[PDB]
């Protein structure tokens, strides 16, 4: 019997790694358990079980692992801070359809392939290109799904400068770690559901 035919068990044990590098498990087990928000559970769930697979392939790199862990400390301490109330920062991004799953999948992919080929000012380059091309035409797909609203160029303007920063971050904390095999390929989509969490709710 193996673990990977229990789809609850392996949930379980992923929450519990990921509760396993923030501050305080035992409290966060608390917030995820008590709270409501379906989405922003889900969201969490998704992310765990990414954790889970990126533990799994970091084990023999020291400083992949360390990035690893300094994402799941990041992310844990924003779900914390946010406390997964009615109104969160937690599920607004998960993608609603196959398509917009199957997006967010390429989107990783390509960062990956930007990532194994390039690095410094042209990985710079390719990866803004990326953000702005993929990463925020994803994003905006999310919010207009909600009330059939189209973006304003305000909104559009200042949440591309926030996601633009905080990717641009993760871009070059994968870009050292490269210079020291599924360490960034797993580190990708942790990195960029802890930006999309960084949008206030």
Not at 97 to 108: I, Q, R, V
Not at 187 to 200: D, E, S, T
């Amino acid at each position: 019997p193996q673990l990977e035919d229990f789809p609850a068990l392996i949930k379980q044990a992923s929450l519990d790694a990921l509760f396993k590098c923030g501050k305080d498990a035992e409290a966060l087990k608390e917030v995820f358990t008590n709270s409501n928000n379906v989405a922003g559970k889900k969201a969490i769930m998704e992310f765990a079980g990414l954790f889970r697979s990126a533990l799994n392939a970091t084990s023999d790199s020291p400083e992949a692992k360390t990035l690893l862990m300094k994402v799941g400390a990041e992310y844990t301490a924003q779900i914390i801070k946010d406390g997964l109330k009615e109104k969160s920062a937690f599920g607004p991004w998960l993608p609603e359809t196959k398509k917009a799953e199957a997006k967010l999948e390429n989107l990783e992919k390509q960062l990956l392939d930007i990532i194994k080929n390039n690095t410094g000012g042209e990985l710079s380059k390719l990866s803004t290109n990326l953000v702005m091309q993929e990463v925020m035409p994803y994003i905006a797909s999310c919010i207009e799904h909600n009330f059939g609203c189209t973006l304003d160029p305000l909104t559009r303007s200042n949440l591309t400068h926030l996601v633009d920063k905080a990717a641009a971050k993760a871009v070059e904390a994968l870009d050292m770690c490269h210079q020291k095999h599924l360490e960034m390929q797993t580190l990708i989509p942790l990195l960029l559901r802890n930006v999309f969490a960084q949008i206030p709710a």
